[PDB]
Amino acid sequence: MVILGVGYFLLGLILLYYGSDWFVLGSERIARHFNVSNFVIGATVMAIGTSLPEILTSAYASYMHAPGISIGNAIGSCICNIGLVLGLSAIISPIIVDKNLQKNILVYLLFVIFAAVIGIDGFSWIDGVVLLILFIIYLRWTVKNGSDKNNPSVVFSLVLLIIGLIGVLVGAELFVDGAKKIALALDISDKVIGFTLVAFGTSLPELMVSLAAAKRNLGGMVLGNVIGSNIADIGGALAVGSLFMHLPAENVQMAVLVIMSLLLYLFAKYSKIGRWQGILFLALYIIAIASLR
């Protein structure tokens, strides 16, 4: 079970490589038909596509009585998205943000701040419902604010979007499956490896898709996907997980997240999310994962 591990591994990379590229092309075309910006389609359709493994993970974790995991993995992804994902994407393709996109980003900053404030004592099922509503309020607002019978072109767009999404979701669980077989053959029979490599497996569709878009200089789409995913992780993953059990409090991760969200706001308004900014986001990401033990 070693060449099978590599076989699963390399196959996963193939389904993640092309899958994310099709998911981006499908999304870009869909945005053109629904007559919305690359940002809007990234903060809604794309976000929910890549943020689904994060919602299902949190909800299940809190279901089987592991709440500290459900929240720790919920916020840890938001930081991973601004730190690793956005950071890497900005180095590849610097992001100049439009002026109609900043109202959206400001809303994101406030929503994160709102989550941090009510998340000091912890997270009730009350907080969950509140945040769950705000999520939907955000979605219908993002689509509306920035805005057919038998069309062969639209169909092709949906094929790219659906096959592309199936590709990255399958490729991610082939990535993990293969890496686990390799790790086992390597001597790593520890248990945090069975949550570290899987936590990375949930952020893997998000990382790949954002990189695929970054390669095609879709800075707006990249930004939308980061913004949308974090809200889907907080307004959705963090919220749904709180319906089962009372999630604990992490006022050090939330603090860091607000900082990275604040920096994102300032960069996407008075400057840009370019290469040096991305380096900083990466720097803040590595002085975090090391200083948070």
Nearer to ligand MYS, 249 or 284 (CB): 284
Binding mask 122-161 for Ca ion (x = CB under 5 A): --x--x----------------------------------
What is the amino acid identity at position 43?
Answer: A
258 binds, among Ca ion, ligand MYS, none (CB under 5 to 8 A by kind): none
Give the burial class of 99: count Cβ atoms within 10 A of its Cβ; 0-12 exposed, 13-18 middle, 19 or more buried.
Answer: exposed
121 binds, among ligand MYS, Ca ion, none (CB under 5 to 8 A by kind): Ca ion
Q: Report the residue number whose CB is nearest to ligand MYS.
A: 266
242's tokens: 């709180």
What's the min distance (Å) between Cβ of 247 and Ca ion? 9
- β strands within the chain, DSSP E: none
3-state secondary structure of 94: coil
191 binds, among Ca ion, ligand MYS, none (CB under 5 to 8 A by kind): none
What residues are paired with 198 via a beta bridge?
A: none
32's tokens: 């053109």
What's the min distance (Å) between Cβ of 273 and ligand MYS? 11
Residues 68-127 that bind Ca ion (CB under 5 A): 118, 121, 124, 127
Instruction: Give per-residue burial for 32-42: e unless 16+ CB within 10 Å, then b.
Output: eebebbbbbbb
Instruction: Give per-residue burial for 46-76: e unless 16+ CB within 10 Å, then b.
Output: bbbbbbbbbbebbbebbeeebbebbbbbbbb
Residues 209-268 that bind ligand MYS (CB under 6 A): 263, 266
Nearer to ligand MYS, 151 or 271 (CB): 271
Place of tokens 């490599």: 197
Nearest-Å Rg of the Cα atoms of the chain is 18
Whole-angstrom CA distances from 48 to 51, 148, 159, 240, 279 are 5, 24, 17, 14, 27
Q: Which of 270, 290, 291, 293 contacts ligand MYS by CB under 6 A? A: 270
Q: Could you say whether residue 271 binds ligand MYS (CB under 6 A)?
A: yes
Nearer to ligand MYS, 266 or 289 (CB): 266
What's the min distance (Å) between Cβ of 60 and ligand MYS? 36
Nearer to ligand MYS, 126 or 266 (CB): 266
Count residues binding ligand MYS (CB under 6 A): 4
Cβ atoms of 236 and 58 closer than 8 Å: no
Residues 39-58 that bind ligand MYS (CB under 6 A): none
Reference 195, options 292, 32, 287, 76; nearest CA is 76
Nearer to ligand MYS, 112 or 209 (CB): 112
Which residues contact Ca ion (rule: CB under 5 A)? 118, 121, 124, 127
Q: Which residues of this protein are in contact with ligand MYS, per CB under 6 A? A: 263, 266, 270-271
